[PDB]
Amino acid sequence: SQIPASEQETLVRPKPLLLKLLKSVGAQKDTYTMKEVLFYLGQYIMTKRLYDAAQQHIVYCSNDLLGDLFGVPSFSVKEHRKIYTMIYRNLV
């Protein structure tokens, strides 16, 4: 799946728990573009080494706060719409 360009610019307010994750990788504000949320989420996945070393599009979050936020043990980075939905489910 793929996201139209205009949706990447959508201004969102992450819930406290998602904000905590983002803050851990440097984010200091309360309102972000979806693009910005995705940047910090990427940084968080990289720092915590949650992606598979062989197929680097698979992310393992079963034993992490990311997994509790997304309600999935794993996901593929290729599922753009599923990822956007998981972020929209954690706004305020």
Binding site: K35, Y51, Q56, K78, I83
Partner: peptide, 12 residues
């Protein structure tokens, strides 16, 4: 690809 390359496709 590297995780970064896949992730960059998702952000843009």
């Amino acid at each position: 690809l590297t995780f970064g390359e896949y992730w960059a496709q998702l952000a843009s």
